[PDB]
Amino acid sequence: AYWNREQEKLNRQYNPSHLNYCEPDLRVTSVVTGFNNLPDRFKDFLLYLRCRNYSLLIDQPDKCAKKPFLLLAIKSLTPHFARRQAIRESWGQESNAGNQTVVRVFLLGQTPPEDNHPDLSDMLKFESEKHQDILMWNYRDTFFNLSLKEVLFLRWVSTSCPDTEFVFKGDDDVFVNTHHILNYLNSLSKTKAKDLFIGDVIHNAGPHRDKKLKYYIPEVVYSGLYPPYAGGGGFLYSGHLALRLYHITDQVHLYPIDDVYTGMCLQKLGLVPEKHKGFRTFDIEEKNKNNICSYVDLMLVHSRKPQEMIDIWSQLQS
Amino acid sequence: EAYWNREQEKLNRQYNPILSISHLNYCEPDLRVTSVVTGFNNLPDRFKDFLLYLRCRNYSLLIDQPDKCAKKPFLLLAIKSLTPHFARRQAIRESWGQESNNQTVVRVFLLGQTPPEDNHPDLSDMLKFESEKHQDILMWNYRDTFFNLSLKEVLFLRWVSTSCPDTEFVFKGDDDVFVNTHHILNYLNSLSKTKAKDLFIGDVIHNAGPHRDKKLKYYIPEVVYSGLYPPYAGGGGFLYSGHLALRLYHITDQVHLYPIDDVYTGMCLQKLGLVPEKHKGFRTFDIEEKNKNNICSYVDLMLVHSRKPQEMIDIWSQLQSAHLKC
Ligand SMILES: *[C@@H]1O[C@H](CO)[C@@H](O[C@@H]2O[C@H](CO)[C@@H](O[C@@H]3O[C@H](CO[C@H]4O[C@H](CO)[C@@H](O)[C@H](O)[C@@H]4O)[C@@H](O)[C@H](O)[C@@H]3O)[C@H](O)[C@H]2NC(C)=O)[C@H](O)[C@H]1NC(C)=O
Ligand SMILES: *[C@@H]1O[C@H](CO)[C@@H](O[C@@H]2O[C@H](CO)[C@@H](O[C@@H]3O[C@H](CO)[C@@H](O)[C@H](O)[C@@H]3O)[C@H](O)[C@H]2NC(C)=O)[C@H](O)[C@H]1NC(C)=O
Ligand SMILES: O=c1ccn([C@@H]2O[C@H](COP(=O)(O)OP(=O)(O)O)[C@@H](O)[C@H]2O)c(=O)[nH]1
Ligand SMILES: O=c1ccn([C@@H]2O[C@H](COP(=O)(O)OP(=O)(O)O)[C@@H](O)[C@H]2O)c(=O)[nH]1
Ligand SMILES: *[C@@H]1O[C@H](CO)[C@@H](O)[C@H](O)[C@H]1NC(C)=O
Ligand SMILES: *[C@@H]1O[C@H](CO)[C@@H](O)[C@H](O)[C@H]1NC(C)=O
Ligand SMILES: [Mg+2]
Ligand SMILES: [Mg+2]
């Protein structure tokens, strides 16, 4: 498998370019058997795997001027204006209660015209100027570039928010019980809090070989099993681990699934993420969707629409 | 026995002397319906809201484009949309919904309110910025819901009569369909004066009935509506003359609002003595699968349902040279 072989090469190089080679890696079309018959997203991933020095087009350099207790980092796409606004008004509110600063950033790439995306750049600039919470990098925002979104976000944390006590990274289609998370973080002993990483962790998972699935991975790309990883909509970790995570990203090749890439970085650090039952990545039962007390005892639910996020958050306040 | 049918019968008696509280601007709750409609308390909330406020339709225009038709348009594009649908509207602006010219084509998006009381995110400042930039937003001060779409129809027809009465033709459609606007212009220019005067074409269905399955999107209880629907064009868009648009609005006062907007339009057409015409170019159920990847499939149709914003821009881009390939 290509990724396995290339990761083995990377280990040798770091125990005596893959970071700023941004020309097409034309060799992959010869080393990967059946390359021409692969879907375009795999072609783009393999051809441009070795480039990750993308620039920040929209920054919020003063987002963490005061040391945050919790940084909310939400992955989003340019046209998702309603999702971002509902998060701003509901569980993603910035706050300062009890000297525990909560700050919010949305993580965006480019939706370029070459991919037939509508030009929403002026709307995005208006949103950025109004809400001061948009981080946007100059790369093609795609599913297979989400591990790139992860690395560039971790880079931003190291340069612009290195002192945040904890980090929540999640999707813009989940409801998050931020009160439950804050109570959980404040209940942690210093021992568990230093290297906290929790979520919906699955062990001994493998790459999907069914070509019809969303997260299909060919045998020529990756072989073997996945490391333990938290996926399904969000995970929570300490700022200390965020710095260790970013430092190790150079030593791990990007992977088409961002949550698997994060698990690889944790495994290279010698850490095992812990499953927490409050991460309901497969939603809750049907009858309980409109029972607010079913949201009291969990961290997040996947998935909810913008209107539902505001409605649940409103009822949650009482 | 059905509520809408009985109330429409009362309305017919008022407007037709041969058959021998306002229904247009009473905007308090019609508290009588909770006793006259059997099982009212067990109806879904959208039916309760529909029945309680049926007699109100004098809603105000919050965002207007009063000079949209300062030059006599040949074709007015009116697209139904919701506040958060920024990507759909922008893709339409860049592709098939471009305004163009001596055949003026103009574009408006038809919006209601997505109020905070209904837990909608506050996107009002974004919408105002969008309106100031593109000048194609029409927004009325009513609750924008599926069962209020016939209100969107009535209020749009009112705007045509007051602000765009001289447009030669009107296309009303959804913000999730691709429209071959070139094909529509060629079709309109091929019309005789006789056929063009009362043009109304689309995906017309005859002898359709209300869905009684409580789980379906367009479910209608037996206590609300009985019998069959009139012939009506639905499924994503229809095309008609501006002369007929004025006749359509004039008759709206004589027809009670209905929870399905396209059925309401068919009711108005039937009251005028007109029958909408089926046109094969309205592909409301999409095209075949392999044909989706052939731009030649799009050169000889009016619209396709449905397409995403990127797909709209991609198809429109390939259509500009389809005359060389097809
Ligand atoms: C289509 O759009 C219509 C216009 O937006 C919608 O009509 C609105 O419907 C809402 C309910 O969804 C009504 O709001 C309710 O009003 C009643 C009565 O409030 C009045 O009386 C109370 C005291 O009893 C007083 O405090 C208020 O100031 C009012 O004078 C309340 O009891 C409810 O709690 C709720 O506020 C709107 O009044 C009504 N607006 C108008 C202009 O008619 C309609 O619902 C939409 N239809 C569909 C199918 O979605
Ligand atoms: C992840 O994001 C990166 C950066 O946006 C993407 O790399 C870019 O990929 C496009 C193709 O999708 C490249 O454009 C192409 O360049 C070749 C050069 O021969 C040309 O033949 C094509 O017509 C097209 O212009 C672009 O150069 C490249 N940018 C950089 C800086 O490398 C990448 O595709 C994204 N990956 C995934 C899996 O989506
Ligand atoms: O190209 C993309 C696709 C998705 N996302 C974000 O990734 C998260 C999860 O996406 P999705 O719900 O489609 O994936 P799934 O739940 O099926 O794993 C959402 O916040 C999206 O906005 C993104 O940032 N870029
Ligand atoms: O409350 C609403 C709901 C829908 N729409 C518009 O109605 C059109 C068709 O709606 P949809 O595709 O969701 O329904 P369909 O009849 O295709 O199942 C679209 O342009 C929507 O933006 C609207 O204007 N207000
Ligand atoms: C990254 O580095 C390479 C050279 O190492 C350079 O050519 C490229 O422009 C840089 N930036 C981007 C956006 O790739
Ligand atoms: C409609 O008209 C009635 C009486 O003229 C008025 O009471 C009502 O408020 C109006 N509805 C509006 C402006 O929404
Ligand atoms: Mg999701
Ligand atoms: Mg539709």
Residue numbers in the entry:
A (entry chain A): 57 to 72, 91 to 392
B (entry chain B): 56 to 75, 90 to 170, 173 to 397
From the paper:
In the acceptor-free B3GNT2:UDP:Mg2+ and SeMet-B3GNT2:UDP:Mg2+ complexes, the Asp333 and Gly-Loop305:307 are only observed in the inactive conformation despite the fact that the latter structure was solved in a crystal form that is isomorphous to the B3GNT2:UDP:Mg2+:LNnT complex.
The majority of mammalian poly-LacNAc is synthesized by the alternating iterative action of β1,3-N-acetylglucosaminyltransferase 2 (B3GNT2) and β1,4-galactosyltransferases. B3GNT2 is in the largest mammalian glycosyltransferase family, GT31, but little is known about the structure, substrate recognition, or catalysis by family members. Here we report the structures of human B3GNT2 in complex with UDP:Mg2+ and in complex with both UDP:Mg2+ and a glycan acceptor, lacto-N-neotetraose.
